[PDB]
Design an enzyme around this catalytic site. Structure first.
Site, PDB file in Angstrom:
ATOM      1  N   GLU A  35       0.815  -1.217   0.000  1.00 52.30           N
ATOM      2  CA  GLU A  35       0.000   0.000   0.000  1.00 52.30           C
ATOM      3  C   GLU A  35       0.846   1.265   0.000  1.00 52.30           C
ATOM      4  O   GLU A  35       0.528   2.214  -0.721  1.00 52.30           O
ATOM      5  CB  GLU A  35      -0.947   0.034   1.201  1.00 52.30           C
ATOM      6  CG  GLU A  35      -2.054  -1.008   1.181  1.00 52.30           C
ATOM      7  CD  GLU A  35      -3.050  -0.842   0.052  1.00 52.30           C
ATOM      8  OE1 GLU A  35      -2.975   0.132  -0.737  1.00 52.30           O
ATOM      9  OE2 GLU A  35      -3.931  -1.739  -0.044  1.00 52.30           O
ATOM     10  N   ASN A  46      -7.924   8.536  -5.894  1.00 48.75           N
ATOM     11  CA  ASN A  46      -8.683   7.521  -6.618  1.00 48.75           C
ATOM     12  C   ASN A  46      -9.509   8.135  -7.717  1.00 48.75           C
ATOM     13  O   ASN A  46      -9.836   9.316  -7.680  1.00 48.75           O
ATOM     14  CB  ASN A  46      -9.592   6.793  -5.646  1.00 48.75           C
ATOM     15  CG  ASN A  46      -8.815   6.144  -4.542  1.00 48.75           C
ATOM     16  OD1 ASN A  46      -7.797   5.493  -4.789  1.00 48.75           O
ATOM     17  ND2 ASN A  46      -9.252   6.353  -3.310  1.00 48.75           N
ATOM     18  N   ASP A  48     -12.562   7.900  -8.309  1.00 49.68           N
ATOM     19  CA  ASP A  48     -13.854   8.399  -7.839  1.00 49.68           C
ATOM     20  C   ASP A  48     -13.745   9.745  -7.113  1.00 49.68           C
ATOM     21  O   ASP A  48     -14.750  10.339  -6.746  1.00 49.68           O
ATOM     22  CB  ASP A  48     -14.601   7.343  -6.993  1.00 49.68           C
ATOM     23  CG  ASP A  48     -13.997   7.134  -5.601  1.00 49.68           C
ATOM     24  OD1 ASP A  48     -12.901   7.657  -5.297  1.00 49.68           O
ATOM     25  OD2 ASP A  48     -14.617   6.415  -4.790  1.00 49.68           O
ATOM     26  N   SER A  50     -12.108  10.208  -4.250  1.00 47.70           N
ATOM     27  CA  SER A  50     -11.644   9.951  -2.886  1.00 47.70           C
ATOM     28  C   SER A  50     -10.121   9.874  -2.882  1.00 47.70           C
ATOM     29  O   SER A  50      -9.494   9.828  -3.949  1.00 47.70           O
ATOM     30  CB  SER A  50     -12.252   8.657  -2.341  1.00 47.70           C
ATOM     31  OG  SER A  50     -11.792   7.537  -3.066  1.00 47.70           O
ATOM     32  N   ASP A  52      -6.670   7.986  -0.697  1.00 47.20           N
ATOM     33  CA  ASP A  52      -6.167   7.015   0.262  1.00 47.20           C
ATOM     34  C   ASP A  52      -5.001   7.610   1.039  1.00 47.20           C
ATOM     35  O   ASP A  52      -4.143   8.275   0.444  1.00 47.20           O
ATOM     36  CB  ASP A  52      -5.644   5.777  -0.470  1.00 47.20           C
ATOM     37  CG  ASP A  52      -6.738   4.935  -1.088  1.00 47.20           C
ATOM     38  OD1 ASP A  52      -7.923   5.122  -0.796  1.00 47.20           O
ATOM     39  OD2 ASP A  52      -6.392   4.021  -1.858  1.00 47.20           O
ATOM     40  N   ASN A  59      -9.149   4.894   2.862  1.00 51.56           N
ATOM     41  CA  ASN A  59      -9.865   5.702   1.889  1.00 51.56           C
ATOM     42  C   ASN A  59     -10.876   6.671   2.510  1.00 51.56           C
ATOM     43  O   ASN A  59     -11.628   6.280   3.397  1.00 51.56           O
ATOM     44  CB  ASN A  59     -10.557   4.737   0.922  1.00 51.56           C
ATOM     45  CG  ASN A  59     -11.148   5.427  -0.259  1.00 51.56           C
ATOM     46  OD1 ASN A  59     -12.331   5.720  -0.277  1.00 51.56           O
ATOM     47  ND2 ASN A  59     -10.320   5.727  -1.242  1.00 51.56           N
ATOM     48  N   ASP A 101     -15.311  -5.050   9.010  1.00 51.53           N
ATOM     49  CA  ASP A 101     -16.505  -4.580   8.300  1.00 51.53           C
ATOM     50  C   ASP A 101     -17.244  -5.671   7.516  1.00 51.53           C
ATOM     51  O   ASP A 101     -18.371  -5.453   7.063  1.00 51.53           O
ATOM     52  CB  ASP A 101     -16.133  -3.418   7.365  1.00 51.53           C
ATOM     53  CG  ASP A 101     -17.341  -2.711   6.785  1.00 51.53           C
ATOM     54  OD1 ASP A 101     -18.160  -2.191   7.567  1.00 51.53           O
ATOM     55  OD2 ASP A 101     -17.467  -2.674   5.542  1.00 51.53           O
TER      56      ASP A 101
END
Ligand code: CL
Ligand code: CL
Ligand code: CL
Ligand code: CL
Ligand code: CL
Ligand code: CL
Ligand code: CL
Ligand code: CL
Ligand code: NA
Length: 129
Positions: A35, A46, A48, A50, A52, A59, A101
């Site tokens: 990562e 990202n 979209d 967003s 990270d 995110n 999650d």
């Protein structure tokens, strides 16, 4: 801060990540390697919109607030900047929520693609832990 491999393993263990949700320490170190290359200051935008953040590339769509991700949530209740600190506490606490999650470490696509199923113990091999 750019951690050493064993240094990060030790810090993750200190913060209770070793075997958290059944994921051994090597899984966490492997995820961080791919990562962020162990760099707490890593950020990546990202498609979209967003972003990270940090050693585990958490995110802003769901987990932290950066003020520029429309329609997003802040489920870790933290500014995304907290995830860039030399102190990994905020990243670890948020990672615990993420991995809980429902999909385990598959939440980290790079973990699924690069760590899952591999000899992840290699990442902590030799470390005084
Ligand atoms: Cl390494
Ligand atoms: Cl391991
Ligand atoms: Cl936002
Ligand atoms: Cl911006
Ligand atoms: Cl929220
Ligand atoms: Cl905030
Ligand atoms: Cl730390
Ligand atoms: Cl799981
Ligand atoms: Na957010």
């Amino acid at each position: 801060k750019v951690f050493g491999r064993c240094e990060l393993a030790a810090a993750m263990k200190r913060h209770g990540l070793d075997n958290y949700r059944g994921y051994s320490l090597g899984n966490w170190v492997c995820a961080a390697k791919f990562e962020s290359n162990f760099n707490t200051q890593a950020t990546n935008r990202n498609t979209d919109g967003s972003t990270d953040y940090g050693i585990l590339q958490i995110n802003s769509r769901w987990w932290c607030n950066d003020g520029r991700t429309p329609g997003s949530r802040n489920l870790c209740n933290i500014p995304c900047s907290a995830l860039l600190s030399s102190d990994i506490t905020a990243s670890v606490n948020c990672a615990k929520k993420i991995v809980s999650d429902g999909n385990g470490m598959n939440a980290w696509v790079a973990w699924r693609n690069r760590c899952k199923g591999t000899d992840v113990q290699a990442w902590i091999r030799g470390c005084r832990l």
